[PDB]
Amino acid sequence: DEVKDYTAENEKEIVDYLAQNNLTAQRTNSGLYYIITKEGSHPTLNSNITVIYKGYFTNGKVFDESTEGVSYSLRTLIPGWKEGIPLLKSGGEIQLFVPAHLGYGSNGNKTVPGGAVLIFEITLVSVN
């Protein structure tokens, strides 16, 4: 096996990005960084959500997007979303700085390399 540790590299890259762009992000104990731009008027682990998210790398290149609302179960998503989405309500906006171990892992997939830091700009439009 060729297991790879990315936690330290991802953390350093995230803090470097948060330094280059003037942003202050709260950090969770799992290594996820989030900024709450706005909230609403809390999705649970078993709850359907609709989002207008946008996802890109540290270089700004977009790997996944949804300009219109897309409905998700939130128990089938990447762990970073699983801990970030329940932080706000309908109409809220959050920015995630998911590390690799909370994203697509040390292997990644097609269009996302292993050990990659993901930035998500998510708007929660409904918690139906």
Partner: protein, 48 residues
Amino acid sequence: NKYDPATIGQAGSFLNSNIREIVTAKSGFNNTNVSEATDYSVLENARK
């Protein structure tokens, strides 16, 4: 529609988890007037 298997029993689905079982197939519907050969049919060892 509300028969989406991906949303079985979420918030406003017309199906509960009982839909997954042959024995409780009828009880797996949330809507009322459902008949065993009109709205659905069941097979146990269906062959692909």
